[PDB]
């Protein structure tokens, strides 16, 4: 509508448009970093979610990548949205989507923000504490409420009491307390997360929330909404893959949450939809030769025009492991050297890749980072003055075919 | 102006404005986080700088806190500006500073941004490598270059490469190489940085800089410009205070770089000018109680700013923040082991792993002093959560000092 979105010409991929944009500027300085973002890649992901998880409705986790072009490609596709604040509710609201396709799945919400949702038609929210019930009572008394339980399958480093998620015990309590309040609680949500070594944590999650529905029942609560959260992998570059996890989800849901029981099942995927769709191209702006060990080569330092304050904040906050790629075509069979790769800022710890093997590169060559769509442009700033890469959005004729059925 | 700046009334202060403003808000909340920023505290810092380091002209490191009101205040006050990018040069030149009060002190610059500098009259730049000299020889061959040398100091962690700074051996090759490209090198810079434990690191870097000046002379440079970088502490709450650093520096400058030798001595303070000036107030928005311990005694409090907004400083700048009660105590009130968390959907958006606080309540305010440096400047709006609005205040007496500096003021 106001985003570029360039249909690919008939033989062309998203990789080809990368090569075109780098060739355009071959002679003419302005070598700023840029992305190529394949909205065709995202419409493939949704088709694949329909086959893999036919009972589960996908609520896109907006925080993952809030670009307006992405939400609206997804809003035309049938997804709901998981939204955590007044500006994400407003974003999705302005893109035409109804009340009924949002869950406000932040367990701990400011009271003015609770009040905003209720004034704008938004009713389903999550919670996991007494103060929160307390707040809703006061500010959204007719809200439909999903209780969030603890899972496991890793947390990053020992520390004591976790951010979100009730015990079964505290849920016993929280179900009663809401009963005191006349607040309708309709379901259970958990969130395993993308540091899942082991798919049976889902089953365990699913089993733990039979318990809590059955604890809904003894108090008088009639619950149907099952939310199994996010954390599904967004590329093929992971060891546990999407369909390995979903093999174990499905007969879990079959044993514990039979369809003839009336249940509705949603989830909140974020990186699954967008991670592989974005490729980042960055320019080599500066270069040091280290005459190394105490036109003359042994180890290398390369500086590029996006870093850990920009797109590579992901290596800090999201634990990403990034992989530098060349799109110089490989030579005959070229020597590699031990190298490091640095961001543009004046900060000694703006460092992207502490050690890797690369061929010798020169100022003005391009490096590529694939799988950079999730938790990347969403959390970047412009610290030190360095601007955000411009994103070019593209689509094949065949993915537009795919789009063009449902809307 | 355009931004939100107010003058104080006489015996009324920045901490006084803070107290008031949380006490106008009390009902129909929307109780969003906010800063009070005292521009008069910047004028204090400047007068103390000119007293403590009389030979040293300060060039403000813009990246520390680029708020336009902070930069316009510093420009009228007369500082130079350390700029690292095209958008920082633009900001300062949009305030009317001349190019001569800029140093483009980023050693590794994108070619296009080097050309922007040369098209806009900014002549003085830093460098530390032979590929940088190549780039300058093509895009800005009359620049006046300043050679950035390696410094010492001991650490957090011990790793394969340091990003900036040539060694003494590298420096001699760089100077011969400049001289063969007919590029003018006019001086030396270094940066010790805000985790110096030992002020003697300044004494060693200053001595190293005199060794590169003499290497210069041997191949035919007349070097005059010494730049001692940044790192000075921005608040009184640090083991190593400002005037202790300045009291080793001063005698080493007189030893290695006497006034009769021609030299001009600058520095690049960033957090020194702005850290203490900003106090941030955040609202408790949520709370959870954790009883008797298994693997009411404890509380967990959720506030509306976090590690993605203003408290990115605990990740990128190693900051240690110190939660302050403002709700004025209760005599000996009973305190509890306590955790504080940001607003995001993220299980690592935590601000303080354990404090001891008195039981508190949704809707109460918690205060964080000295939050001006490396905070707002690196904040994002991840998860849709918005940046705290800043309120600028200044005293009538700070405004007149600023005018007595207010700084056309000099040449011939």
Curated annotation (Swiss-Prot), chain B:
Post-translational modification (record): S-Nitrosylation inhibits the enzyme. S-Nitrosylated in vitro on 4 cysteine residues.
GO MF terms held by the record: ornithine decarboxylase activity; protein homodimerization activity
Catalytic activity line of the entry: L-ornithine + H(+) = putrescine + CO2
The organism's place on the tree of life at top rank: Eukaryota
GO-annotated biological processes: cell population proliferation; kidney development; polyamine metabolic process; positive regulation of cell population proliferation; putrescine biosynthetic process from arginine, via ornithine; regulation of protein catabolic process; response to virus
Subunit text: Homodimer. Only the dimer is catalytically active, as the active sites are constructed of residues from both monomers. Does not form a heterodimer with AZIN2.
Active-site feature positions: 345 (proton donor)
Activity regulation as described: Inhibited by S-nitrosylation. Inhibited by antizymes (AZs) OAZ1, OAZ2 and OAZ3 in response to polyamine levels. AZs inhibit the assembly of the functional homodimer by binding to ODC monomers. Additionally, OAZ1 targets ODC monomers for ubiquitin-independent proteolytic destruction by the 26S proteasome. Inhibited by 1-amino-oxy-3-aminopropane (APA, an isosteric analog of putrescine). Irreversibly inhibited by alpha-difluoromethylornithine (DFMO).
Cofactor(s) named in the record: pyridoxal 5'-phosphate
EC number per UniProt: 4.1.1.17
Recorded metabolic or biological pathway in which this protein acts: Amine and polyamine biosynthesis; putrescine biosynthesis via L-ornithine pathway; putrescine from L-ornithine: step 1/1
Annotated gene: ODC1
Annotated source species: Homo sapiens
Induction and repression of expression: Down-regulated in response to enterovirus 71 (EV71) infection (at protein level).
Protein name: Ornithine decarboxylase
Function noted in UniProt: Catalyzes the first and rate-limiting step of polyamine biosynthesis that converts ornithine into putrescine, which is the precursor for the polyamines, spermidine and spermine. Polyamines are essential for cell proliferation and are implicated in cellular processes, ranging from DNA replication to apoptosis.
Keywords: Decarboxylase, Disease variant, Hypotrichosis, Lyase, Phosphoprotein, Polyamine biosynthesis, Pyridoxal phosphate, S-nitrosylation
SUPFAM superfamilies for the chain: Alanine racemase C-terminal domain-like (SSF50621), PLP-binding barrel (SSF51419)
Binding site for pyridoxal 5'-phosphate: 194, 231, 268-271, 374
GO cellular component: cytoplasm; cytosol
